[PDB]
Amino acid sequence: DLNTLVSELPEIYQTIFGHPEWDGDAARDCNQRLDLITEQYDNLSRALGRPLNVLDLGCAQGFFSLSLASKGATIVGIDFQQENINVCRALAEENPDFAAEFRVGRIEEVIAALEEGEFDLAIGLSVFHHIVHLHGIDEVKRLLSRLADVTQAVILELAVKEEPFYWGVSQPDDPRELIEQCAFYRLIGEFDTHLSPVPRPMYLVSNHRVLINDFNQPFQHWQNQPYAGAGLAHKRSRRYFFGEDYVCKFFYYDMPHGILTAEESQRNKYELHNEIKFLTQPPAGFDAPAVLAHGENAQSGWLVMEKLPGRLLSDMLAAGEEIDREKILGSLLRSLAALEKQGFWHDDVRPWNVMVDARQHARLIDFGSIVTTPSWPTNLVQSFFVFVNELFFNLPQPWSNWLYAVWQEPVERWNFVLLLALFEKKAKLPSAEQQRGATEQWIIAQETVL
Ligand SMILES: C[S@@+](CC[C@H](N)C(=O)[O-])C[C@H]1O[C@@H](n2cnc3c(N)ncnc32)[C@H](O)[C@@H]1O
Ligand SMILES: Nc1ncnc2c1ncn2[C@@H]1O[C@H](COP(=O)(O)OP(=O)(O)O)[C@@H](O)[C@H]1O
Ligand SMILES: [Cl-]
């Protein structure tokens, strides 16, 4: 009998599924977490086009497991307490149509034994802190990595050090330390535990999918830096995910260890905001990539775009790949000239901001640096020369002749329309080497070093 099994529970942690007579006795009501978990289940189930296989780690009295089984899920629940599992099985029997299995077992062992594809979704609510306490942070990070590796998605409610209990002292400084090694993560809620005033964050984590309420898709690889050789400029607060026809930029506004300034957060916020603005409203006759999704919240913001073919110029340069400098410069200058005519300029023309397709046509890929108003744009023309030089001191005829021509122009005349015009006629232009010159060359060379 259920009554006896319930009585022999060391603790009625959760609501007893289907038995409201014990609702008052339950430490946690579970309705709030359930509402959120069911929402995420639905999202993922919709995306994959079917009911899910779900793994419930430290399943206690089976509330979440049974609740999901109720909606059609196939579930396996694990708990290391025999009493808990006995209740779960009993409840399952009262609901014979539910596809629900329960096993007495250790989370550590089950995770080690998992195979990829076995489960779509794993839930681990207020359990991993126990594992941290006995086995340390590094082992837990590995467990969670593997869990992520073998599933599509993972939901965790994580206990925190601020909680007033003795075990809090073993906890990481920040719960994100347990998951940040995983590819994708988002805060999805915060819950009152009724143990104390300190709430527990609930995180949605994945090593295989971008999981955004509006956009739920696999990705094939991701990176923590914008390009090969970026170093640590953004202090790792930015992540990039690449899928079949999309790129997802995910910016953290909030980082652990307080590492993001105020200024840096705001710049993350500003760049993303700025990028969305431009892409949603681009100028006529400018092939700009398309916006598939976007959003912001307190912790972070994101943008999903159409993917554009090709390789990043800076990589190609570094990896000594063969390039057509004429086609690259021509295509790029053409786009800059056209932007300018529409009263747009790009503040940051660099190799890491240029993408080159298989036909050696080049385009800009970072629209964070796009601007509308300012003498000007004389500075931008100047940097473009550096760009040119780095793309190759280094300029053969007629590129040198081109630059020399521009340098002979009064500064009021300098803009991208001019730069392009002269570029197009560069073979006709006088020879730089035949003139005193010689300074245009030395200035940029120093600039380009600088
Ligand atoms: C505090 S409760 C949380 C219960 C449930 N996940 C929830 O939040 O509603 C922790 C549960 O995990 C179980 N547990 C703790 N450590 C475990 C481990 N290493 N392996 C399996 N179960 C564990 C306990 O028996 C208990 O049922
Ligand atoms: N539309 C896109 N298609 C393909 N790759 C992209 C696209 N947008 C960005 N990237 C990639 O993102 C990386 C950094 O993107 P970027 O636009 O520089 O973001 P940020 O500079 O704000 O970090 C680039 O190295 C590039 O590989
Ligand atoms: Cl936890």
Residue numbers in the entry: 4 to 377, 381 to 398, 416 to 473
From the publication, what sentences describe this entry?
We therefore designed, cloned and expressed a new construct, WbdD556 (residues 1–556), that was purified in the same way as WbdD600. We found a single native crystal that diffracted to better than 3.0 Å resolution (crystal category A), although there was no obvious visual indication as to why and this could not be reproduced. This crystal grew from the ammonium sulfate-based condition, but was harvested more than six months after the plate had been set up. During the intervening time, approximately half of the volume of the reservoir solution had evaporated, leaving a much higher (∼2 M) concentration of ammonium sulfate. By comparing the unit-cell parameters of the different crystal categories (A, B, C and D), we found that the decrease in length of the cubic unit-cell axis from 185 Å in crystal category D to 167 Å in crystal category A generally correlated with resolution. Data from a serendipitously found single native crystal that diffracted to 3.0 Å resolution were non-isomorphous with a lower (3.5 Å) resolution selenomethionine data set. Using this crude model as a mask to cut out the 3.5 Å resolution electron density yielded a successful molecular-replacement solution of the 3.0 Å resolution data set. The resulting map was used to build a complete model of WbdD. The best diffracting crystals (which also belonged to space group I23) had a unit-cell parameter of 158 Å, which is again considerably shorter than the 167 Å unit-cell parameter of the native crystal that was used to solve the initial structure.
WbdD is a bifunctional kinase/methyltransferase that is responsible for regulation of lipopolysaccharide O antigen polysaccharide chain length in Escherichia coli serotype O9a. WbdD is a soluble protein that controls the length of some lipopolysaccharide O-antigen polysaccharides that are synthesized in an ABC-transporter-dependent pathway. WbdD from Escherichia coli O9a contains two enzymatic domains: a methyltransferase (MTase) domain and a kinase domain. WbdD stops polymerization of the chain by phosphorylating and then methylating the phosphate on the terminal sugar.
